[PDB]
Enzyme design. Structure first.
Site, PDB file in Angstrom:
ATOM      1  N   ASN A 172     -51.093  10.648 -42.184  1.00 49.35           N
ATOM      2  CA  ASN A 172     -50.761   8.820 -43.148  1.00 49.35           C
ATOM      3  C   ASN A 172     -52.291   8.531 -42.570  1.00 49.35           C
ATOM      4  O   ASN A 172     -51.790   6.401 -42.464  1.00 49.35           O
ATOM      5  CB  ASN A 172     -50.013   8.479 -43.643  1.00 49.35           C
ATOM      6  CG  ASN A 172     -48.926   9.253 -44.580  1.00 49.35           C
ATOM      7  OD1 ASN A 172     -47.675   9.850 -43.886  1.00 49.35           O
ATOM      8  ND2 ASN A 172     -49.240  10.475 -45.217  1.00 49.35           N
ATOM      9  N   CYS A 196     -48.210   1.158 -32.811  1.00 51.21           N
ATOM     10  CA  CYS A 196     -49.446   0.914 -32.196  1.00 51.21           C
ATOM     11  C   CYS A 196     -50.603   1.580 -33.601  1.00 51.21           C
ATOM     12  O   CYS A 196     -50.885   2.276 -34.003  1.00 51.21           O
ATOM     13  CB  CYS A 196     -49.902   1.639 -31.586  1.00 51.21           C
ATOM     14  SG  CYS A 196     -51.806   1.568 -30.938  1.00 51.21           S
ATOM     15  N   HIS A 243     -51.363   6.369 -39.718  1.00 47.26           N
ATOM     16  CA  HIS A 243     -50.731   6.142 -38.413  1.00 47.26           C
ATOM     17  C   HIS A 243     -51.238   7.458 -37.314  1.00 47.26           C
ATOM     18  O   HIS A 243     -51.158   8.545 -37.367  1.00 47.26           O
ATOM     19  CB  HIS A 243     -49.404   6.246 -39.070  1.00 47.26           C
ATOM     20  CG  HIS A 243     -49.133   5.504 -40.250  1.00 47.26           C
ATOM     21  ND1 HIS A 243     -48.943   4.460 -40.134  1.00 47.26           N
ATOM     22  CD2 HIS A 243     -49.411   5.377 -41.584  1.00 47.26           C
ATOM     23  CE1 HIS A 243     -48.605   3.700 -41.671  1.00 47.26           C
ATOM     24  NE2 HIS A 243     -49.387   4.147 -42.019  1.00 47.26           N
TER      25      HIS A 243
END
Ligand SMILES: O=C(O)COCc1ccccc1
Ligand SMILES: O=C(O)COCc1ccccc1
Lengths: 269, 268
Positions: free
Chosen positions: A190, A227, A192
């Site tokens: 995704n 983050c 991330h």
């Protein structure tokens, strides 16, 4: 892997790979953490969850809700060696409207003994706004049929370390590793940052001599904020304590915004 | 996995894991590269090599010699999807006193079609002084019995991209990613940076838009010097052209070259 007879839990076996081990020729805590997430994913696939990218029930997909990790707790008694087969059993439990929990039990496939255990607390969140929310009845009814109804805990104990409150590390830190950045291999499907990367970043500020002479027995990690791919992290560690305990803090390099806080317990080799 | 009938090659099957894939839900080139090294390690274990940390024959261990990767070449036609089973066949070959070669063939376990191929050139070196040595007869005789004697090439074709000379990128670079550092997860069981980390670092300077709209078809990478655990790397890339790029990894301070390579990407 496969669901167990009652269809309420999932088991999978893994052979530890050459690149998955550290200096001791045993799996790192990051390899273990990756195996836990993989067996969780295979459990969701086996019970009808689509391969979309996020495990969502019918109501979750409609309302753009996702499960996000809020806390991860791992305890390892023995790390599997390179070439050894580790068996992992996993299951989920509803925690009412607060959220949901995934638990794991790690075993040596040859001896059948428990070599580790883990637990993770998930909270529901809108994918777009990043706002947390309680689990609704419609969502709960949809996933409750895949969970044991009676309590089943990986960490049963009364005063166990998976429910302790973690304090915020105060400056100055005893040790630190600055300028940590994710590369593409640290991202998931995704885009991330993978939750296991944060574990690696936490461990980067543990001095090498502690790593060479001790074994990581327990790690508790809270996830506060993500983050981003273009963010830079500072990893901070202070000894709090034959056992060594540490208090950890990950924060953004510039503004100092907290992303994670955690604790580790190490035992003498 | 297992050795084939003649005991001259090794096969292993892998199921692609959830964290091993990129945004296309297919294995990254780094996951592929990790699988190639794993199947190489399992082949060395199956033919009597000890689990010491470095694959060495009796005379290699006595003279403190190790095989080190000098060049890696990978070509992918189709990347396996998350949950798919990929079958990898690997074998080694004597390249006289120059060194050794390991080759791989990747196949879809369901269709049986070749989805990729790889080759790596190894050179012998003293593990303490870091000095390259030619392969002696004593070492040759010891490992030749585990290799096919007639040539068996993953890239047989004449004028193939695995034997091209790579030029040094000239400053200024078109694109760059600076301040790259290895973490503990980038190290192997011997505390050296894993060869696959260098592939990741090379790819860090490819702009994201190229990654989002193209698929990596070919990567050629030369290994010149190791990045130590306390070193910092700068990744440099310039378009030379399908899109082709010329790559350079160098130490952040003095600019000492660690790797040079090339990539070829196809439009999605
Ligand atoms: O662990 C994951 O990645 C997702 O698991 C979802 C789930 C699986 C089974 C039962 C309830 C929920
Ligand atoms: O790929 C490796 O890690 C080492 O393989 C050594 C080898 C294996 C079989 C035949 C010749 C040499």
């Amino acid at each position: 892997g496969s669901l167990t007879e009652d269809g309420l839990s999932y088991k999978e076996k893994f052979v530890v790979r050459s690149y998955e081990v550290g200096s001791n020729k045993t799996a790192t805590v990051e390899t273990i953490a990756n195996l836990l997430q993989e067996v969780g994913c295979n459990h969701a696939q086996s019970v009808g969850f689509s391969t979309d990218g996020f495990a969502t029930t019918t109501t979750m997909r409609k309302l753009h809700l996702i499960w996000v990790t809020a806390r991860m707790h791992i305890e390892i008694y023995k790390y599997p060696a390179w070439g050894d087969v580790v068996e992992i059993e996993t299951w989920c439990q509803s925690e009412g409207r607060i959220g949901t929990r995934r638990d794991w039990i790690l075993k040596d496939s040859v001896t059948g003994e428990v070599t580790g255990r883990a637990t993770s607390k998930w909270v529901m969140m809108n994918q777009d706004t990043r706002r947390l929310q309680k689990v609704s009845d419609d969502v709960r009814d949809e996933y409750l049929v895949f969970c044991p109804q009676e309590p089943r805990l990986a960490f049963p104990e009364e005063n166990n370390r998976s429910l302790k409150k973690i304090p915020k590390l105060e400056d100055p830190a005893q040790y630190s590793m600055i300028g940590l950045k994710p590369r593409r291999a640290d991202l998931d499907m995704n885009q991330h940052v993978n939750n296991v990367t944060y574990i690696g970043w936490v461990l980067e500020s543990i001095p090498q001599e502690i790593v060479d002479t001790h074994e990581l027995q327990v790690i508790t990690l809270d996830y506060r904020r993500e983050c981003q791919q273009d963010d830079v992290v500072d990893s901070l560690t202070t000894t709090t304590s034959n056992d060594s305990q540490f208090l950890h803090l990950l924060r953004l390099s510039g503004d100092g915004q907290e992303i994670n806080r955690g604790t580790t317990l190490w035992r003498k080799k």
